[PDB]
């Protein structure tokens, strides 16, 4: 909408107090016009059509129940734009500063949030698996970097490029995450899943057997459930970036870490230059290679490091 830029304050989901970019005009709107062409936040009111209607408020308060998933969808929504806008020169997720679009509250007790081809969308959760799920900045990050895999490499969701997709989402929730430098760590979700049960995460990517998930390629899913195992297999490549980052011995493979600027810097350059809609998992380890190569020199540490991490979790 056209208006005046404003600054409203509120709680996210967490209980946490922080500023918001608004617009007003009448009401105010969560709509940012800071960031490329805006970040604009809707409200979905429990329903399933979409977006919903902008999400306007009376006094730029935003210290409701209610308002908390919103509040969160769009500050974490502002906080990857300027990731990606700072350390990789991207201008939001296609690159020339579209609009980036969040809807909340979307249907009843949803376990799970998504880009839908246009935007993205937040369940509230149930209360028990999830709260809702715009309270996790790796979340947030995770799905807006769905639309940044979409508009590059273009990975088709299933089987081995599908698992790249998801990996791909993960490496760079927790990159935002650490970003923004508030509790980060390698576990993804840890923020919004299961409020009963402390220390736990929906994924580990320091340790994804933690979860069932496999860390290395010899344990790869096969089978046909969640489109050829995307959120199962991306366990092995989630392991590799860790790896690359942090190093370890693994499967009695040495890997020497390079720190998670270097990793971010490799794996979003073999996104956006050598990943392509139907690349698998042997074909993401030479664009890795070729990347590391390409900013770091063939002789380089950060090459030799990319190898071992690949070696390590089986993947040539
Ligand atoms: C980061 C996380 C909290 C949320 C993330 N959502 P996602 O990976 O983003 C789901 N995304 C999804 O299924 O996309 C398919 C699609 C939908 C609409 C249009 C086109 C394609 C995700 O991992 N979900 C699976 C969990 C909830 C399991 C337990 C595997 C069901
Ligand atoms: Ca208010
Ligand atoms: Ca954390
Ligand atoms: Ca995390
Ligand atoms: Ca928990
Ligand atoms: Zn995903």
């Given at each position: 909408?056209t208006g005046?830029?404003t600054?409203?304050?509120?709680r996210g989901?967490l209980?946490?107090?922080?500023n918001?970019?608004?617009?007003?005009?009448?009401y105010?709107?969560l709509?940012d016009?800071?960031?490329?062409?805006?970040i604009?936040?809707?409200?979905?009111?429990?329903?399933?059509?979409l977006?919903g209607?902008?999400?306007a408020?009376?006094?730029?308060q935003?210290?409701?129940?209610?308002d908390?998933?919103?509040?969160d969808?769009?500050?974490?929504?502002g906080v990857?734009?300027?990731?990606?806008k700072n350390?990789?020169?991207?201008?939001?997720?296609?690159?020339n500063?579209?609009?980036?679009?969040?809807?909340?509250?979307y249907?009843?007790g949803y376990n799970?949030?998504?880009?839908?081809?246009?935007?993205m969308?937040?369940?509230?959760?149930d209360?028990?698996?999830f709260?809702?799920?715009?309270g996790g900045?790796?979340?947030?990050?995770?799905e807006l970097?769905?639309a940044?895999?979409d508009?590059?490499?273009?990975?088709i969701?299933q089987?081995?490029s599908?698992?790249?997709?998801?990996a791909?989402?993960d490496?760079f929730?927790?990159?935002?995450?650490?970003?923004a430098n508030?509790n980060?760590?390698?576990?993804?979700g840890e923020?919004?899943?299961?409020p009963?049960?402390?220390?736990?995460?929906?994924?580990?990517m320091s340790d994804?057997?933690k979860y069932?998930?496999?860390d290395?390629?010899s344990?790869?899913?096969?089978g046909?459930?969640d489109?050829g195992g995307?959120?199962?297999n991306?366990?092995?490549?989630?392991?590799?970036?860790?790896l690359?980052?942090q190093?370890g011995t693994?499967?009695?493979?040495?890997?020497?870490?390079?720190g998670?600027?270097?990793?971010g810097?490799?794996?979003?350059?073999?996104?956006?230059?050598?990943?392509?809609?139907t690349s698998?998992?042997?074909?993401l380890r030479?664009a890795?290679v070729?990347?590391?190569?390409?900013?770091?020199?063939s002789?380089?540490q950060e090459?030799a490091?990319?190898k071992?991490a690949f070696?390590?979790v089986?993947?040539?």
């Open positions: 909408i005046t830029s600054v409203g304050v509120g989901v209980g946490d107090q922080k918001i970019n608004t617009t007003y005009s009448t105010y709107y709509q016009n800071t960031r490329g062409n805006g604009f936040t809707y409200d979905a009111k429990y329903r399933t059509t977006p209607s902008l999400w408020d009376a006094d730029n935003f210290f409701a129940s209610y908390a998933p919103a509040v969808a769009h500050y974490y929504a990857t734009y300027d990731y990606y350390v990789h020169n991207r201008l939001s997720y296609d690159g500063n579209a609009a980036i679009r969040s809807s909340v509250h249907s009843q799970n949030a998504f880009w839908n081809g246009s935007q969308v937040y369940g509230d959760g209360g028990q698996t709260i809702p799920l715009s900045i790796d979340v947030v990050a995770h970097t769905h940044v895999t508009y590059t490499a273009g990975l969701y089987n081995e599908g698992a790249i997709n998801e791909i989402s490496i929730g927790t990159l935002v995450e650490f970003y508030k980060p760590d390698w576990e993804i923020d919004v899943y299961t009963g049960i402390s220390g736990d995460s929906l994924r580990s994804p057997a069932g998930d496999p290395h390629y344990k790869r899913y096969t046909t459930q489109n995307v959120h199962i991306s366990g092995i490549i989630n392991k590799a970036a860790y690359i980052s190093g693994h499967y009695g493979v040495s890997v020497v870490g390079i998670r600027d270097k990793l810097k490799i794996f979003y350059r073999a996104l956006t230059q050598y990943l392509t809609p698998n998992f042997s074909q030479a890795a070729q990347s590391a190569t390409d900013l770091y020199g002789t380089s090459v490091s990319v071992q070696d390590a089986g993947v040539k």
